[PDB]
Write an enzyme that holds these catalytic residues in place. Structure first.
Site, PDB file in Angstrom:
ATOM      1  N   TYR B  57       0.812  -1.225   0.000  1.00 53.81           N
ATOM      2  CA  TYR B  57       0.000   0.000   0.000  1.00 53.81           C
ATOM      3  C   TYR B  57       0.842   1.271   0.000  1.00 53.81           C
ATOM      4  CZ  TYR B  57      -3.698  -3.302   1.048  1.00 53.81           C
ATOM      5  OH  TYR B  57      -4.573  -4.361   1.009  1.00 53.81           O
ATOM      6  N   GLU B  59       0.933   3.414  -2.142  1.00 52.26           N
ATOM      7  CA  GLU B  59       0.168   4.488  -2.801  1.00 52.26           C
ATOM      8  C   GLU B  59      -1.031   4.817  -1.937  1.00 52.26           C
ATOM      9  N   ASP B 173     -12.001   8.638  26.282  1.00 47.33           N
ATOM     10  CA  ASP B 173     -10.629   8.371  25.852  1.00 47.33           C
ATOM     11  C   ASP B 173      -9.980   7.547  26.952  1.00 47.33           C
ATOM     12  OD1 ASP B 173      -7.970   8.293  25.220  1.00 47.33           O
ATOM     13  OD2 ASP B 173      -7.647  10.463  25.220  1.00 47.33           O
ATOM     14  N   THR B 199      -5.268   4.380  22.635  1.00 44.09           N
ATOM     15  CA  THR B 199      -3.981   4.066  22.042  1.00 44.09           C
ATOM     16  C   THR B 199      -3.768   2.559  22.143  1.00 44.09           C
ATOM     17  OG1 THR B 199      -2.906   4.595  24.166  1.00 44.09           O
ATOM     18  CG2 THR B 199      -2.911   6.299  22.495  1.00 44.09           C
ATOM     19  N   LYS B 202       1.213   2.027  25.578  1.00 39.59           N
ATOM     20  CA  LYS B 202       0.948   2.217  27.006  1.00 39.59           C
ATOM     21  C   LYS B 202       0.556   0.897  27.663  1.00 39.59           C
ATOM     22  CE  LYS B 202      -0.355   6.982  26.036  1.00 39.59           C
ATOM     23  NZ  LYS B 202      -1.198   8.174  26.317  1.00 39.59           N
ATOM     24  N   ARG B 208       2.819   1.989  18.817  1.00 35.76           N
ATOM     25  CA  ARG B 208       2.132   3.276  18.857  1.00 35.76           C
ATOM     26  C   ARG B 208       1.023   3.228  17.835  1.00 35.76           C
ATOM     27  NH1 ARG B 208       3.986   8.169  21.041  1.00 35.76           N
ATOM     28  NH2 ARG B 208       2.585   9.061  19.468  1.00 35.76           N
TER      29      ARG B 208
END
Lengths: 382, 387
Positions: B57, B59, B173, B199, B202, B208
């Site tokens: 991928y 592009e 969150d 995320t 953590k 990440r």
């Protein structure tokens, strides 16, 4: 002694392992002609898979910076952008004001220039014409997957003429430039952006170059970080500094000529009538074929490319009259001219089947797929 | 393979980068990481991130993505997931655009017309009645819970009730506590929020990246539109980490993380500093240095020289400048990953206290103490090697 640390993915996660293996097989057994694709070194893999991931929830950045500056003879670099688009974005946010007019190529008030309907070549008199007219604060060269040389000096001249800065997005040709096989925009643009993958054969990512210190500061401000990715960039820049990379690019270029000639001899056209780089823009019109149908049939046959709307294409965009090919990936796996001529032969075989069966010919696709498999096994990766 | 491009390692090919990598390894190996958002990923996650999936991928679904989705859905008992975001902030950003209109008032935690709620000056805890009053007055279209590194439980059911009362959507969150929730050791916001963001690193101990959850298909569609080249190797890493998190072993990891925080907090408290909220319900410790007249920056800087990494951290209503602060924030995930138990974290606490005491006379630092602590830290880590 702790398996969290000791055991491999393969040993721990059958499903993900399985998926990775299928992907490996995709890469091993098919010919990849997508112009933007490549195959990274084991070294780049090692970087991306390094413990550097466990940070910033740096030496490698320093290395990346010094290497890219050397590679492109630039006074300043930023290697932080997570992508080419993000590099481009940072530059615009730094060199342009909201409401500014920006003049860029297409194959903020965004204005576009393109190529001539009659020659398929860049409209320079017309780029100027139009810069003069609309008074852009920023002119952007490159950006488009254009198969001919770009005249950065001329772009800079036009820029100067109207008090505009020149930005060059060399993402599609960075490796070619790095090998000294295309004019270096660093010598002519106020700022240069690029990707780290594609013809630079690194991880996905971006960077920005300039010779102007004050521009550099603005760039730094306007611009993760993924240190393992930055390590990967360092590795790739290091590879590009080597003679082996020059030889690679030499073969990429020669391979594109070989493939292009075969396709032309086989009765299709090339946009601009050939190429100066790794890119081939195939015009299928002489065979009455369609881009989408050709892309699909080729893929079934084990050859991946992109459908591509030719300039002033008579077809709607979901159809198109072309495909776009590139030699970087196949060259990386070891293909030379003979191999790319074979690939050409096979492509033409599929084209011919489609002429009497636009929906596809299974029999032909299968045969081709198997020949492709055989060719690939002679040039193994990883 | 015959071709060194394919056959040779980074170690063999690039001495300078290899050196940098080795130095980083040594940093991770010989120091105690107490930054609450930091962790140490499995070899399996490394393998994924270093996989051939990178060669796709260029592009700008897929098996590894489908796996990630299936897994995170099961992990959080969510009807829908998007695992595409490159970061937590990107996930948050997408959801905010999904659910909120420009010019809207948004009410979120802090320790669009952006409005904030915090903790009570009284109790040093969230006061839900205070938050409700803010909502009633300001009529936000969107309320955000979590987001902040808050060391106590969050009552998501109550946040939802507050949101309902003013016709607002609720976003949670859960980045700072995702792993704790994943293990079932904190109430799951998927049951209460319209949308949950997070995320993948953590406390989830992955690469990440971000993701988004919802039980509502219509919201999912909106999220997917809002979120839209992908790093398939990273997505694979997500899949691996979600898989790990589904295991009983992961539950044990979190169990230890939590107990370890209590242990560390107890020692610091007995040592004559305060903890914001007087303790913790999770992996986080917010240290209030005021009783020893110490400053966050000075303490952070000294600890780091002593081989213990943390962040300076403003306490609620901190009288100090935010570049100084009256506190530090600690977390037990990274140390727990390398195998520390309660006893080990008590030791770390003891060593932290040694540094505090040196600083009470010499706030700009004490080399002797710092270097001694650094050696003891080295010896501790040596007993719990990584990779």
């Amino acid at each position: 002694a702790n398996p969290f640390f000791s055991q491999s993915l393969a040993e721990r996660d059958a499903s993900v392992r399985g998926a990775i293996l299928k992907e490996l097989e995709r890469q091993q057994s098919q010919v990849e002609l997508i112009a933007s694709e490549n195959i990274v070194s084991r070294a780049v893999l090692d970087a991306q898979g390094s413990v550097l991931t466990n940070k910033y929830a740096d030496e490698v950045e320093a290395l990346a910076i010094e290497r890219v500056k050397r590679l492109f003879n630039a006074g300043h670099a930023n290697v932080q952008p997570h992508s080419g688009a993000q590099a481009n974005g940072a530059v615009m946010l730094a060199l342009a004001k909201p409401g500014d007019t920006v003049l860029g190529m297409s194959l903020f008030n965004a204005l576009q220039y393109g190529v001539s309907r009659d020659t398929m070549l860049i409209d320079y008199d017309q780029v100027e014409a139009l810069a003069q007219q609309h008074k852009p604060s920023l002119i952007i060269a490159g950006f488009s997957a254009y198969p001919r040389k770009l005249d950065f000096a001329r772009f800079r001249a036009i820029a100067d003429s109207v008090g505009a800065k020149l930005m060059v997005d060399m993402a599609h040709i960075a490796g070619v430039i790095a090998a000294g096989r295309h004019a270096n925009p660093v010598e002519h643009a106020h700022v240069v952006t690029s990707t780290t993958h594609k013809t630079l054969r690194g991880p996905r990512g971006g960077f920005v170059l300039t010779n102007d210190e004050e521009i550099a500061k603005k760039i730094n401000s306007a611009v993760g970080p993924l240190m393992h990715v930055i390590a990967g960039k360092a590795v790739a820049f290091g590879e590009a500094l080597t003679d082996d990379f020059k030889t690679y690019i030499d073969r990429v270029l020669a391979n594109a000529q070989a493939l292009g000639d075969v396709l032309k001899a086989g009765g299709v056209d090339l946009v601009t009538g050939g190429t100066d780089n790794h890119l081939l823009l195939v015009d299928l019109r002489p065979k009455g074929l369609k881009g989408a149908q050709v892309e699909q049939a080729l893929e079934r046959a084990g050859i991946t490319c992109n459908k591509n709307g030719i300039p002033f294409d008579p077809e709607k965009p979901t159809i198109t009259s072309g495909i776009r090919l590139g030699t970087p990936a196949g060259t990386t796996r070891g293909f030379g001219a003979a191999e790319f001529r074979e690939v050409g032969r096979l492509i033409l075989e599929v084209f011919e089947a489609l002429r009497t069966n636009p929906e596809g010919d299974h029999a032909t696709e299968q045969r081709v797929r198997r020949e492709i498999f055989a060719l690939c096994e002679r040039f193994p990766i990883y």
